[PDB]
Every structure is written in structure tokens, then in C-alpha cells.
Design a protein around this ligand. Structure first.
Ligand code: A1BW7
Length: 296
């Protein structure tokens, strides 16, 4: 791949915590420690709107499947469901007793999953805003939560060193260095997990075996988003504490590109759903989002 910087997105006044493309590929949403959500054009980076209401910084944001809603996780111990068109807060999800770190819709987007520093995973009903289940998931802050492709499964990770798979319908656990990020692969059969020994590993969870290991980057202090890039060549994409975006060949485990430009830890990366486009975001010495594009 030949990812090249195309746009730098300026607006946040503190660290950018997460960037996520909308499923229709039209928009990029960003969350920040400055308590704001900002929406940008996915292809040109043009600022669109600021969405405000959280009383403390935001660690994560995520899109509903139809690209109409957002959910945000905030240090004010709540999540908020937003109507992106109107910018209005539809619901405020209360129940966590500490910072909410991570969040996601299920594919049907009738549920929300959240991970918190209170060490629980919570499952929320989008329509009523009610908390349906509270899982005593870990013995340390929860670093990531993600649904599989039909929402029947939740994968969570934690600084306690564990990665666990949960049955959404019952809340019960199906399967078990700090684990700082996890997410299901696009086909649903693998789990990409990051640990704070500068390592990413691809796990076949049905077999419970580690298939591939990716090294080269620096990840010892922060929880960093990683991604499967599938629009062109099959890559693993992740941020790094050396201010670079790393891209690995999924199959060969070779580093094939390092995207240079950010001036602080690259804490978030995201891959566009149909075009060879990467978005990346950095901590408070940088505060900008960058859009990178590749011919393949
Ligand atoms: C999750 O538990 C722990 C956390 C930490 C500190 N610490 N470590 N990483 C991040 C942070 C906080 C800062 C941050 C981080 C990570 C992200 C990226 N981000 C957000 C949601 N999900 C992800 C991968 C964003 C930010 C915000 C400044 C913008 C220390 C101990 C434990 C435990 N026990």
C-alpha cells in the first residue's frame, strides 16, 4: 500500500480519543477529551458539526448500523445516544459507577455495550435506554468491548490480562500483560487483541489458538485502537506510541508501511468501509485527525 496524507482535521482542543467512519462511508465521527463530538466529511475532511452535552471528556464514540445514531462513553460515568442529524441527545445511559471507556452498537443496533473503569460490562437497550444486563466482567478497568457479526457474542478485554467472550442473550461467559484492545475480525471468526508488551495477536477463538503475531510498534502505556483493513490488501492497522501509524500484511506479518506525520501518540485509527482510506488521531501535543489515502 502507499497511504499518503491527504487532509489534517483541526478542531479539538484536547486529546482526540477515538475516530470512527460511518457505515455508509459518508462521515467521520471523532470524540475528544475536550468533551465534544465532531463530525467531518469522510472523503474531504470538511468539518460538519460539533455535538455537545457531556460534562467531562469522552473516551469513545460509535455509529449505529444505519449511520443515524451515535453513542459516546464519557468520564461523567454516562453514555449518551445522539441523533446525528439533529445533534440532540436522545438518551443518557446511567448506571456505571466510574468512567465509561469504550462502547459499541450491535449489528442490529438495538443494543449498546459499554466497558468502564468500574470493571463491569453493561448491555443497554437503545430504545428505552434501560440497562438490560451488568456483567462482572473483569477485575480491572475494561479496555474494549465489541459485538460479533450477528450480535450474539461480546468480546471484552481488560488490564487484568484477560480476554473474555460473552453470550449477549444470557450475559454468561463462554470462553476466557494487560490486554489493551480487542475486536472481532470482519468474517467474525478471529479476534485481534493488543497487549501492552508491544504486541498484536490474531486469535481463532473457536479453536482458542493464536494464529499470527504482529510486532514492530511501541505499545506499553495506552489502549490503542487496531483495525482490519479489507477494502484493498488485507492489512492490520494500528496506532503507536512512537507517533506512527503501523500497517502489517495480515498474512505475512510484515510491516508494509509506517505513516509519519502525527506529533503525539497515535491513539486511534479507523479504516473506511469501502475506500482505501485511513483516519488517525493523536494525543494532546497534536490534537488533529489525519486522513490518508492509498491506491490499493
Ligand atoms: C483502560 O484502563 C486503564 C487506562 C489507563 C490510562 N489510559 N490508557 N489508554 C488510554 C488511557 C486514558 C487516555 C486514553 C486512552 C486510550 C484512548 C483510546 N481509546 C479510547 C477508548 N478506547 C480506546 C482504545 C483514548 C484516551 C484519551 C485521551 C484521549 C490506565 C490504567 C488503566 C487500567 N487498569
Amino acid at each position: 500500500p502507499n497511504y499518503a496524507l491527504k487532509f489534517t482535521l483541526a478542531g479539538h482542543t484536547k486529546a482526540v480519543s477515538s475516530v470512527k467512519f460511518s457505515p455508509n462511508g459518508e462521515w467521520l465521527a471523532s470524540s475528544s477529551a475536550d468533551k465534544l463530538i465532531k463530525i467531518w466529511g469522510a472523503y474531504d475532511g470538511k468539518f460538519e458539526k460539533t455535538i455537545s452535552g457531556h460534562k467531562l471528556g469522552i473516551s469513545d464514540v460509535a455509529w449505529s448500523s444505519d449511520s443515524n445514531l451515535l453513542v459516546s462513553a464519557s468520564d461523567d460515568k454516562t453514555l449518551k445516544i445522539w441523533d446525528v442529524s439533529s445533534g440532540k441527545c436522545l438518551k443518557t445511559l446511567k448506571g456505571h459507577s466510574n468512567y465509561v471507556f469504550c462502547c459499541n452498537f450491535n449489528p442490529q443496533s438495538n443494543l449498546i455495550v459499554s466497558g468502564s473503569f468500574d470493571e463491569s460490562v453493561r448491555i443497554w437497550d437503545v430504545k428505552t435506554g434501560k440497562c438490560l444486563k451488568t456483567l462482572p466482567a473483569h477485575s480491572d478497568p475494561v479496555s474494549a468491548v465489541h459485538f460479533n457479526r450477528d450480535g450474539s457474542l461480546i468480546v471484552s478485554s481488560s488490564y487484568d490480562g484477560l480476554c473474555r467472550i460473552w453470550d449477549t442473550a444470557s450475559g454468561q461467559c463462554l470462553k476466557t500483560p494487560p490486554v489493551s484492545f480487542v475486536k472481532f475480525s470482519p468474517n467474525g471468526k478471529y479476534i485481534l487483541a493488543a497487549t501492552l508488551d508491544n504486541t498484536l495477536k490474531l486469535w481463532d477463538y473457536s479453536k482458542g489458538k493464536c494464529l499470527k503475531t504482529y510486532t514492530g510498534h511501541k505499545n506499553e502505556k495506552y489502549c490503542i485502537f487496531a483495525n482490519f483493513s479489507v477494502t484493498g490488501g488485507k492489512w492490520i492497522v494500528s496506532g503507536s506510541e512512537d507517533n506512527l501509524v503501523y500497517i502489517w500484511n495480515l498474512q505475512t506479518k510484515e510491516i508494509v508501511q509506517k505513516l509519519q506525520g502525527h506529533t503525539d501518540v497515535v491513539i486511534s485509527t479507523a479504516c473506511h468501509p469501502t475506500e482505501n482510506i485511513i483516519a488517525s488521531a493523536a494525543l494532546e501535543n497534536d490534537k488533529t485527525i489525519k486522513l490518508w489515502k492509498s491506491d490499493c
